[PDB]
Each structure stands twice: as C-alpha cells, then as structure tokens.
TrEMBL record, chain B:
Function: Complex I functions in the transfer of electrons from NADH to the respiratory chain. Accessory subunit of the mitochondrial membrane respiratory chain NADH dehydrogenase (Complex I), that is believed not to be involved in catalysis. Accessory subunit of the mitochondrial membrane respiratory chain NADH dehydrogenase (Complex I), that is believed not to be involved in catalysis. Complex I functions in the transfer of electrons from NADH to the respiratory chain. The immediate electron acceptor for the enzyme is believed to be ubiquinone. Involved in the interferon/all-trans-retinoic acid (IFN/RA) induced cell death. This apoptotic activity is inhibited by interaction with viral IRF1. Prevents the transactivation of STAT3 target genes.
Lineage: Eukaryota, Metazoa, Chordata, Craniata, Vertebrata
Record note on quaternary structure: Complex I is composed of 45 different subunits. Interacts with CARD15, but not with CARD4. Interacts with STAT3, but not with STAT1, STAT2 and STAT5A. Interacts with OLFM4.
Location(s), subcellular: Mitochondrion inner membrane
Stretches that traverse the bilayer: 25-45
Protein name per its UniProtKB record: NADH dehydrogenase [ubiquinone] 1 alpha subcomplex subunit 13
Protein family membership: Belongs to the complex I NDUFA13 subunit family.
C-alpha cells in the first residue's frame, strides 16, 4: 500500500503550491496597501484553479532554435527533483527511513540546479545564457556555506538521520545553542530557492525572465510549482531542524498540528522577507558568502567540533 | 464676493523636517541576550546528551545480554 502513501504525499503538496500562489498574491498585495485576488471566488479561492487550467490550455510554442531534448527534459526533472526529496522528512514518521537522509537532501539539492542549466542552454538566447551564468554563480555562493551550516548544526544530533532529529528537540530547541547558525541557514535557504532578494535568475528588471524567458505556458508552470514546492519543503526542513516540536507516539496529531503551524508561519515570514528588500547584485553574492559568511561559519564549525569535547556532551550515534 | 481664500487665522503649521524615532536596545543588551541564550542551550544540550548516552549504554548492554541465544 505504498502507492496510496506516495500519492497522498505528492498530490496535496501540489495543492499546497497552488494555495501558496493564492496567499502569495494576497499577502504581497496586503503589505503594498492593496487587496489581493478576491473577485473570482469567495476571497479568491478559485484563483489557483483558473491559473492552473489557463496555463494548460495555451499553446506550448516550442522555439525553432531550441534543442528540443533538454528543452523538454528540464521542467520534468525540476518538478521531480522538487518532489523526490520530500521523502526523508519526518512527518512525524517519514515515508522512507534513510539513515543518511541529510546526504540525500544535499545531493538532490545539488541536482536541482541542472534543470536551470539545461533550460538556460537548451533555449538559444542571450538572456537564458546570462540566467544560467547567474545560477552557476548562485550555486558557487550557496553550496560551500550550506554544507558547513548543515554539518555544524547536525554535530549535536549525532547522526545523519532525520528521524533522530525529532528526539533531540525533547528538551530544548537547537535554535538556542545555534542561533547564529540559524541566521546563516535562513540566509542560505533564501539564496538556494531563488527567492528575492536572492532571486537573480527570474529577474524582472535585470532580465525579462532569465532561464525560462523562452518558455511559454505548459512547460513554464512546472518551474513555478517546482520552486514553490522547493520553498515549502525548505521551510518544513528548517522547522524540523531548528524548531522541532513535541512528539508523542500515541498521538501524531499533536506533532502534525505543531509542525504544520510552525512551517506555515515560517513560509509567511518568507513571504514577508521576499518583498521588503532590494535585489542583490550577483557580484555581491560571492562578495558576501565567500567573504563574510565563510570565515564566520568556519569559526562556528570548529567551535561546534570542539564544544562537545569541552562540556563532555558527545551525542550518541544511535 | 466669494472666492477660494485661506481663513482669517490662516492655516496651521505643517511638519516638513525628517523625524526618525531611534529605537531598540543598546548593542550590549542584544549581545548579552544572545550569549545567555547560547549558554542556556549549551547546558540543556549537555544534560540531554548525557542522558541519551546513558540510555544508549543501557540498550547496548541489553543487546549484549541477548546475544548468545541468537
């Protein structure tokens, strides 16, 4: 009966992506002193359905100069990669109980850029090439910091399993002994998912649309849902990493309620962040992450290496 | 005659200079708050990791007792 579990994992996150678009437009209007979409349905509840049907009855409009192989291969790979790393998340019991789920998340997150590169190179245009180059620079910036953030936060967990991450929260949150690393991790999740002020690929003022500027409707919606599943899942991962809740084996309802509310609040905070700051230049992206973030996280990494030896607090690996 | 005219006493003063509030704690206060939160988290993690090591030792010795029959 794993098929039913897989379907119930993969369909409601797509529905969550659609209603994330709804509340995205609503809240993003609301801090701009205007209302959101509320004409189509009662408080605009039918906006995602109209958006989804509208993109799928348009014309795909494949370009002549585009190499059709990677042009048709990039969005499906993007949607699959945004979908395939949801499994090791404990919810409170994960789909697949992998001992090294952090490594799986890291490797499938490294794979997620390849759809952007193949969509940039497959379409023959200068804007797609510039978007691919900026995505490459964004990956250069964020990977070498994000790996060390995850390792140094994970050093008190004792193992790479995400199931044992819920055990460590039973006394106190790990955001209290690792609040600077929490700031580093939040900026890194801002940078990875390509959300403002770290967008730099789907630019409106710099480029037209960047990596998918030649992508018409149908294939374009896959990148949209992939990015929104990415941000929802990344906020769920941050919630599990730093603000893990109280788990009771006899009632999973408590933990589902708690992490759902916490991840929803973190996504609202992400929406709050994404439209209050100017967009960064991509030359200042590695003038910050390679210059200010890296020495600080090296110092904190060696501090978290030498800290359980200091206090005699070596965590168990099991 | 009737025409658009300011009143007899004129219009009131209008503010036209910059007014920034200047707010928040002093930097020593947030540094002390962060350091205290760090120390509290370190102490709690220390206690819970020691308890986890004790529980792991208990489970391992149960496994060692169970080994010969298996």
């Amino acid at each position: 009966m794993f098929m039913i579990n897989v379907l119930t994992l993969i369909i409601p996150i797509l529905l969550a992506v659609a209603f994330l678009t709804l509340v995205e437009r609503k809240v993003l209007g609301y801090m701009q002193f205007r209302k959101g979409p509320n004409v189509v349905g009662p408080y605009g509840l039918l906006q995602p359905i109209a958006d989804a049907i509208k993109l799928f009855i348009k014309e795909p409009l494949r370009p002549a100069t585009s190499s059709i192989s990677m042009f048709i291969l990039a969005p499906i790979l993007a949607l699959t990669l945004a979908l395939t790393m949801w499994i090791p998340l404990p919810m409170p019991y994960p789909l697949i109980n992998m001992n090294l789920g952090v490594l799986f998340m890291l490797a499938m997150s490294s794979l997620a850029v390849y759809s952007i590169l193949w969509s940039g190179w497959a379409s023959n245009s200068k804007y797609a090439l510039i978007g691919a180059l900026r995505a490459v620079a964004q990956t250069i910036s964020y990977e070498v910091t994000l790996a060390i953030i995850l390792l140094s936060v994970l050093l008190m967990n004792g193992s790479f399993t995400l199931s044992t991450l819920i055990i460590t929260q039973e006394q106190v949150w790990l955001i209290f002994p690792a609040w600077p690393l929490a700031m580093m991790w939040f900026i890194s999740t801002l940078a990875e998912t390509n959300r403002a002020p770290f967008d730099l690929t789907e630019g409106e003022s710099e480029l037209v649309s960047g990596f998918n500027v030649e992508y018409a409707a149908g294939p374009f919606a896959l990148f949209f849902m992939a990015e929104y599943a990415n941000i929802i899942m990344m906020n769920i991962f941050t919630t599990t990493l730093f603000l893990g809740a109280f788990h009771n084996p006899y009632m999973p309802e408590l933990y589902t309620i708690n992490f759902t509310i916490k991840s929803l609040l973190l996504s609202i905070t992400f929406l709050w962040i994404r439209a209050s700051y100017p967009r960064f230049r991509y030359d200042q992206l590695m003038h910050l992450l390679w210059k200010n973030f890296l020495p600080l996280t090296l110092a904190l990494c060696m501090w978290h290496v030498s800290l359980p030896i200091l206090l005699s607090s070596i965590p168990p690996q099991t | 005659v009737k025409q658009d005219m300011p009143p007899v006493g004129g219009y009131g003063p209008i503010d036209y200079k910059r007014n920034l509030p200047r707010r928040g704690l002093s930097g020593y206060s947030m540094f002390a708050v962060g350091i205290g939160a760090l120390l509290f988290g370190y102490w709690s993690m220390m206690r819970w990791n020691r308890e986890r090591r004790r529980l792991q030792i208990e489970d391992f010795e149960a496994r060692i007792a169970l080994m010969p029959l298996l």
